[PDB]
Amino acid sequence: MASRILLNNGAKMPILGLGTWKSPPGQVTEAVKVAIDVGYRHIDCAHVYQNENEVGVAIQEKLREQVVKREELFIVSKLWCTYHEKGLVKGACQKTLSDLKLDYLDLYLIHWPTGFKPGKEFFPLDESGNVVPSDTNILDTWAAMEELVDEGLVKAIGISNFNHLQVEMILNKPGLKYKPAVNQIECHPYLTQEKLIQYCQSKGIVVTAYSPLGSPDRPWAKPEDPSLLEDPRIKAIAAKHNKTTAQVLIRFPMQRNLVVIPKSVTPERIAENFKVFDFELSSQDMTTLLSYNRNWRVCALLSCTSHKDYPFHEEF
Ligand SMILES: NC(=O)c1ccc[n+]([C@@H]2O[C@H](COP(=O)([O-])OP(=O)(O)OC[C@H]3O[C@@H](n4cnc5c(N)ncnc54)[C@H](OP(=O)(O)O)[C@@H]3O)[C@@H](O)[C@H]2O)c1
Numbered sequence: 328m329a330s331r332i333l334l335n336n337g338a339k340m341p342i343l344g345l346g347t348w349k350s351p352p353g354q355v356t357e358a359v360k361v362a363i364d365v366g367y368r369h370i371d372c373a374h375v376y377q378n379e380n381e382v383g384v385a386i387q388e389k390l391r392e393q394v395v396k397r398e399e400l401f402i403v404s405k406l407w408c409t410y411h412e413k414g415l416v417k418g419a420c421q422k423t424l425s426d427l428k429l430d431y432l433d434l435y436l437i438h439w440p441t442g443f444k445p446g447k448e449f450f451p452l453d454e455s456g457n458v459v460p461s462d463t464n465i466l467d468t469w470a471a472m473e474e475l476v477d478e479g480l481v482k483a484i485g486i487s488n489f490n491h492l493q494v495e496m497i498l499n500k501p502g503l504k505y506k507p508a509v510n511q512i513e514c515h516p517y518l519t520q521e522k523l524i525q526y527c528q529s530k531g532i533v534v535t536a537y538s539p540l541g542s543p544d545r546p547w548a549k550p551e552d553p554s555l556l557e558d559p560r561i562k563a564i565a566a567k568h569n570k571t572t573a574q575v576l577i578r579f580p581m582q583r584n585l586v587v588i589p590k591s592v593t594p595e596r597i598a599e600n601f602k603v604f605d606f607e608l609s610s611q612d613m614t615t616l617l618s619y620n621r622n623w624r625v626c627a628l629l630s631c632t633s634h635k636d637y638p639f640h641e642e643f
């Protein structure tokens with residue numbers, strides 16, 4: 328297991344990154360500091376997580392301390408839905424850069440295919456509670472993302488939560504200048520994404536697996552949802568390998584040639600989650616873990632099911 332995967336922009340991406348959604352602003356600076364100390368070289372961020380300033384404090388301290396060089400870090404952020412207008416994309420990117428206190432991003436993603444009315448609210452609502460869409464389509468947002476590359480603000484651009492027909496729309500875009508480098512999508516043994524992953528990989532798009540542990544801290548969790556970390560069948564595979572269940576859940580996407588971004592603010596778990604370069608799941612183990620799919624989603628963006636570009640009506 329090589330630690331980096333080559334992207335279609337010619338850059339190499341660390342296959343293990345630290346996630347930061349739900350990382351409290353008072354804890355994420357230490358979490359990122361610890362992660363860099365123990366080997367992480369990829370951080371997944373987003374403006375909508377509201378903690379990029381604090382992530383950036385950690386990155387800047389470790390660069391100043393010469394723990395790491397900027398070229399060795401792979402920092403990812405995402406354009407929120409209320410900034411899909413061509414006129415707003417550069418400013419959104421520059422706010423993220425200023426907060427992370429970076430002069431470029433390694434990868435900038437369209438966070439969802441759905442554009443929303445611009446304004447202060449991240450989910451603008453009409454008086455009946457529906458998200459108010461914007462009329463800007465993904466192809467024009469993609470052209471705006473391409474401009475960021477040509478201005479030196481980002482080294483790579485990509486997409487997130489795009490279904491196969493939306494990926495296809497970008498790939499067939501008239502005048503397409505840069506293909507997406509990455510599609511970041513939810514992926515774990517209960518949502519194995521075999522069709523979308525094969526589609527993307529056949530097109531040279533690298534897939535990043537989010538919520539690889541099933542996001543036990545998601546705010547809408549219910550007692551009765553399936554729990555990957557407690558699943559006896561996955562615990563048994565971990566036991567056989569003398570690893571934790573989380574380590575198996577992280578190694579699993581790695582062996583599918585995916586990038587994976589487990590979140591933790593717990594220093595011991597940050598370190599444990601990185602220790603996944605000392606063991607191999609068998610092909611039998613991989614097939615068995617794939618057999619647990621149930622099309623169960625952590626992130627279904629339920630407030631936006633009537634948006635024209637809602638991604639999860641389509642089978643994949
Ligand atoms: N593109 C998108 O739309 C999108 C959507 C969702 C997620 N993401 C990205 O993907 C990242 C990861 O997904 P996620 O945050 O939803 O969930 P996750 O990484 O599947 O799970 C995070 C949860 O697992 C816990 N945990 C971490 N390591 C553990 C271990 N070794 N043992 C037991 N529990 C462990 C964490 O607890 P502690 O933190 O308390 O340790 C936290 O409660 C995000 O943070 C974000 O960066 C992107």
Ligand SMILES: NC(=O)[C@@H]1C[C@@]2(NC(=O)NC2=O)c2cc(F)ccc2O1
Binds near residue numbers: 349350351544545
């Ligand atoms: N959807 C979201 O991104 C936030 C996440 C979160 N906000 C946050 O900082 N950690 C969280 O889990 C949150 C917490 C809640 F209690 C209720 C909604 C909610 O939604």
